[PDB]
Amino acid sequence: QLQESGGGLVQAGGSLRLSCVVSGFFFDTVTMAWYRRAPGKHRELVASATAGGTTTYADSVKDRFTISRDNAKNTVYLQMNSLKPEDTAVYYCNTFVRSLSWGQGTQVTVS
Amino acid sequence: IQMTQSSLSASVGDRVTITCRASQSVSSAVAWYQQKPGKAPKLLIYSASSLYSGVPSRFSGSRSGTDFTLTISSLQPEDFATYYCQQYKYVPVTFGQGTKVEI
Amino acid sequence: DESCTTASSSLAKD
Amino acid sequence: FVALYDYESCTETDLSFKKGERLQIVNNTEGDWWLAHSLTTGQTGYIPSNYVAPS
Amino acid sequence: TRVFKKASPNGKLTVYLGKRDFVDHIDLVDPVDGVVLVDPEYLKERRVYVTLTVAFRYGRGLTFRKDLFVANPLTRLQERLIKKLGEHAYPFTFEICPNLPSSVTLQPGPEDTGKALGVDYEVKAFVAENLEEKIHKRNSVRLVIRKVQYAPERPGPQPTAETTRQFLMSDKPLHLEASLDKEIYYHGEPISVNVHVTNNTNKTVKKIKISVRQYADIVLFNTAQYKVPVAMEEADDTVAPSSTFSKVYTLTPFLANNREKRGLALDGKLKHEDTNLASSTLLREGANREILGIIVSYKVKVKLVVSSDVAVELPFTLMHPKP
Amino acid sequence: VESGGGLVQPGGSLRLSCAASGFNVYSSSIHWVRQAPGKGLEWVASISSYYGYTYYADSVKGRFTISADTSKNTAYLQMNSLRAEDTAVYYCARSRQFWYSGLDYWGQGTLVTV
């Protein structure tokens, strides 16, 4: 099971920081991803953090997003800075392979 | 295991929506029953939005993960009964509270 | 390690 | 060389046989599935490994 | 629509499948399609291999199997899956030739505890630098699917058979005529064996024994043809010489009284679950009996006993209707 | 069509008798159901004649004992020891019993209050 933090109402021009906590053995040598779901549509893939700490993005935007991966504390950090109305969605976290039980996510709303 | 679904408006010719949210990975094994007051149940939907052979295209269903929705496409005076959402995946078969229709 | 449990996921109707 | 069973395939590259004997191969395969040729049948294609017996 | 999915214990793999019940039409079998979602970190070493295997298990590993191998034509499901997932969803697809058998598991004996004894279909995906470096099972995924058939929509003629036999010393033969009310009976539906008998022989029927006998054979094993009684019924109706009898018995095969039987074929189980009696096997060609598989057929046996014995056997189709 | 039970002092046992023609007791799965006045429908018992298993709601596991006759197409809900909380309308069911558990057939429901 996994749990996530952050999430809440934001206004354009600011920034929001999001993070997750992962139990089990699915974190240490496994890249950790994040996802976003549009209302009524399937989830979109946001960013990544690999085992070595470097990042690779499947995002079609690939602008102003910071990913921090912690190999010790059991957490993964995703950062939002370029807020756009399209960011109005519910954000989730899981592995790139989405191995862990896909649980409750967090919601971000702008404008 | 349990499922949660109270009073709908009886404005004819409208489209209404009722939600019956589960509490587990029920895997869409949900059927919606309906019985007029005093009579035995009559099923309308089973699995995902599969209408019963004896009812028009008026009725409809939906699905989103572990969230279920029944929707009457066009209210006609034929039906103002109570709808019971039931799951059949776990041996303690369970029902929703049920909602009647009264404006 | 033991095996995982077969789950399910959502794709678009279209 | 020897096949013990009945196997038929719907793929164009896969050979089908009824317990064939003496199927041609220079030596064992280089992957998982094997290649074979039959003189009496006269087609060349791949055959699965579990169905080849020695000389 | 929903698509099946399995994860890996390592957290570096995921297998998707549109369905785990692939309908077997008479001429073409549905294709197995899906996409494997894999971690680029171990992908940097080597790509992903996907395996489709079909195995038959008997005895108490003792297993004969066919292993189709694919190492990583796009159907609509494949296109949708890749569109949702993205770059690393490397697709795969197997084609099942029709001659392959369907999913059927036997009845487990109470003295033993096994997963199953019968045909199973499996889909696998792993990562390895070489084809022989299979060291860690923790890096794999094992998903089980089934292939099933449904009853044809064109039933045959009314199954009927009769036997006229003079019992020992007799004047004219006893005429037993048994007629089922159709050929395609769904699972559990009554078999209304219409029975008519007339006689002139001095003999008489003391008991009438009506039963449903399930016939199954193991093509892999030599001289393996198993039949066990199901829903045996023994009525005491009598017809003395020079009479005429007519009755409609409603027999019904079922599982409750036959659960203690050994080798009673049932429908294919995914988990350690419980399923109904096995369905019959369809085929449209003059196919040579494939090495793997279990062919299941049902026949109704009607028997008469006198102070000697006669009986006729009537075949019927026992399958689920097409959904 | 169903002939209920009653005419008994409270706490006294009864035996329901529900009939619904046409179906086969084996191929159909006979389910039983209760609805208290002012309370929603809740499952009570279920018997699968083809399988041979019987399932009860945990509240009435030791009090009820269901039984159906194969050759009569009838269901019975033998309530050995009721109380005052078991006064309700009870519907018997005849559901498709093959990879489906929809109770897509029913009989009449008869009150069990005296």
Contacts of A29 in chain E (CB under 8 A): 41
Asked if residue D46 lies in contact with residue D14, where contact means CB atoms within 8 angstroms, the answer is: yes
Contacts of C4 in chain E (CB under 8 A): 6-9, 141
Asked if residue B46 lies in contact with residue B34, where contact means CB atoms within 8 angstroms, the answer is: no
As a CATH number, domain B3-103 is: 2.60.40.10
Asked if residue A19 lies in contact with residue A10, where contact means CB atoms within 8 angstroms, the answer is: no
Q: How far apart, in whole angstroms, are the C-alpha atoms of residue A95 and residue B35? A: 46
Asked if residue E34 lies in contact with residue E10, where contact means CB atoms within 8 angstroms, the answer is: no
CATH assignment of the domain containing E308: 2.60.40.640
Q: How far apart, in whole angstroms, are the C-alpha atoms of residue A101 and residue A93? A: 10
> Any chain E CB within 8 A of the CB of D9?
yes
Interface of B with C in 22-51 (CB under 8 A): 25, 27
Do residues E170 and E97 share a domain? no
Closest partner residue to B91 among F55, F100, F108, by Cβ? F55
Please provide the distance, in angstroms rounded to a whole number, between the alpha carbons at the two ends of chain A.
32
Asked if residue E143 lies in contact with residue E32, where contact means CB atoms within 8 angstroms, the answer is: no
Contacts of B96 in chain F (CB under 8 A): 40
Does E142 sit within 8 Å of C7, measured CB to CB?
A: no
- Among the residues of chain E, which ranges form H helices? 40-43, 76-85
Which superfamily is assigned to F1-112 in CATH?
Immunoglobulins (2.60.40.10)
Residue numbers of the domain that contains D40: 1-55
Q: In what order do the strands lie in the sheet with B67-72?
A: B16-19, B67-72, B61-64
Asked if residue E8 lies in contact with residue E139, where contact means CB atoms within 8 angstroms, the answer is: yes
Question: Number of residue pairs across D and E with CB atoms under 8 Å?
Answer: 30
Binding residues of E: 227, 232, 301, 303
Helix, strand, coil in percent for chain E, rounding step 5? 5, 45, 50
Helix (H) or strand (E) holding E41: helix E40-43
Contacts of C10 in chain B (CB under 8 A): 64-65
Q: How far apart, in whole angstroms, are the C-alpha atoms of residue E149 and residue E239? A: 43
For chain A, the chains sharing at least 3 beta-carbon pairs closer than 8 angstroms are: C, E
Other residues' Cβ atoms within 10 Å of the Cβ of residue E62: 9
Which distant-in-sequence residues (6+ apart) come within 8 Å of A34 by Cβ? A18, A20, A45, A46, A47, A48, A67, A76, A78, A91, A92, A93, A94
Other residues' Cβ atoms within 10 Å of the Cβ of residue D26: 5
> Any chain F CB within 8 A of the CB of E238?
no
DSSP 3-state of E40:
helix
Interface of F with B in 72-91 (CB under 8 A): 91
Mutate which of E146, E181, E187 to test chain F, going by most F C-beta atoms within 10 A?
Answer: E187
Nearest to A107 by CA among A11, A5, A8, A4: A8
Do residues E51 and E180 share a domain? no
Binding residues of E for 1D-myo-inositol hexakisphosphate: 227, 232, 301, 303
| E86, closest residue in chain A (CA to CA) | A58
Does C7 sit within 8 Å of B25, measured CB to CB?
A: yes
Sign of CA pseudo-dihedral E78, E80, E83, E85: negative
Q: How far apart, in whole angstroms, are the C-alpha atoms of residue E147 and residue F13? A: 50
Provide the residue ranges of all domains of chain B, joining segments of one domain with +. 3-103
Q: Tokens in use for E265?
A: 């074929």
Q: Tokens in use for E290?
A: 């494939």
Residue that finishes a domain, picked among E83, E115, E148: E148
Do residues E181 and E130 share a domain? no
Residues, chain D: 55
Question: Number of residue pairs across E and F with CB atoms under 8 Å?
Answer: 36
CATH assignment of the domain containing D13: 2.30.30.40
Kindly report the nearest CA distance between residue A106 and chain C, in angstroms: 19
Does C4 sit within 8 Å of E2, measured CB to CB?
A: no
DSSP 3-state of A98:
coil
Touching chains A and E? (3+ Cβ pairs < 8 A): yes
Does E84 sit within 8 Å of A42, measured CB to CB?
A: yes
| Sole residue written with tokens 């019940």 | E21
> Any chain A CB within 8 A of the CB of E65?
no
> Any chain C CB within 8 A of the CB of E16?
yes
Contacts of A99 in chain E (CB under 8 A): 7-8, 10-14
Q: Tokens in use for B27?
A: 């895997």
Q: How far apart, in whole angstroms, are the C-alpha atoms of residue E123 and residue E119? A: 14
Beta strands in E237-284 (DSSP E): 244-251, 266-267
Provide the residue ranges of all domains of chain A, joining segments of one domain with +. 1-111
Mutate which of C3, C6, C10, C11 to test chain A, going by most A C-beta atoms within 10 A?
Answer: C10
| E145, closest residue in chain C (CA to CA) | C6
B63, B66, B70, B71 alpha-carbon torsion, rounded to 10°: -50
Asked if residue E17 lies in contact with residue E32, where contact means CB atoms within 8 angstroms, the answer is: yes
Touching chains C and E? (3+ Cβ pairs < 8 A): yes
Residue numbers of the domain that contains E206: 160-318
Q: Tokens in use for A10?
A: 């934001």
Kindly report the nearest CA distance between residue C2 and chain E, in angstroms: 7
Closest partner residue to E86 among A30, A45, A51, by Cβ? A45
| B64, closest residue in chain C (CA to CA) | C10
Q: How far apart, in whole angstroms, are the C-alpha atoms of residue E11 and residue E136? A: 13
DSSP 3-state of F58:
helix
Does C7 sit within 8 Å of B65, measured CB to CB?
A: no
Touching chains D and F? (3+ Cβ pairs < 8 A): no
Sign of CA pseudo-dihedral E76, E78, E79, E83: positive
Residues, chain C: 14
Asked if residue B86 lies in contact with residue B37, where contact means CB atoms within 8 angstroms, the answer is: no
Q: What is the resolution of this structure in A?
A: 3.5
Closest partner residue to E5 among C3, C8, C12, by Cβ? C8
Which distant-in-sequence residues (6+ apart) come within 8 Å of F106 by Cβ? B40, B41, B42, F20, F91, F92, F93, F94
CA distances to B36, B74, E19, F41, F88 from B99, rounded to whole Å, are: 12, 17, 34, 12, 19
> Any chain F CB within 8 A of the CB of E255?
yes
Q: DSSP characters for chain D?
A: -B--SEE--SSTTB--EES--S-B-SSS-SSSSEEEE-TTT--EEEE-GGG-B--
> Any chain E CB within 8 A of the CB of A50?
yes
The DSSP symbol for E84 reads H
Q: Tokens in use for F3?
A: 């002939």
Residue that finishes a domain, picked among E148, E168, E193: E148
Interface of C with A in 1-14 (CB under 8 A): 1, 4, 7, 9-12
Closest partner residue to A42 among C1, C7, C10, by Cβ? C10
CA distances to A34, B10, E196, F52 from B78, rounded to whole Å, are: 48, 11, 50, 40
Q: How far apart, in whole angstroms, are the C-alpha atoms of residue F66 and residue F104? A: 20
For chain B, the chains sharing at least 3 beta-carbon pairs closer than 8 angstroms are: C, F
Radius of gyration, alpha carbons of chain D: 10
Closest partner residue to E291 among D6, D10, D31, by Cβ? D6
Contacts of E290 in chain D (CB under 8 A): 6, 8
Does C10 sit within 8 Å of A102, measured CB to CB?
A: no
Kindly report the nearest CA distance between residue A110 and chain C, in angstroms: 25
CA angle F51, F55, F60 (to 5 degrees): 155
Kindly report the nearest CA distance between residue C7 and chain A, in angstroms: 9
CATH assignment of the domain containing E62: 2.60.40.840
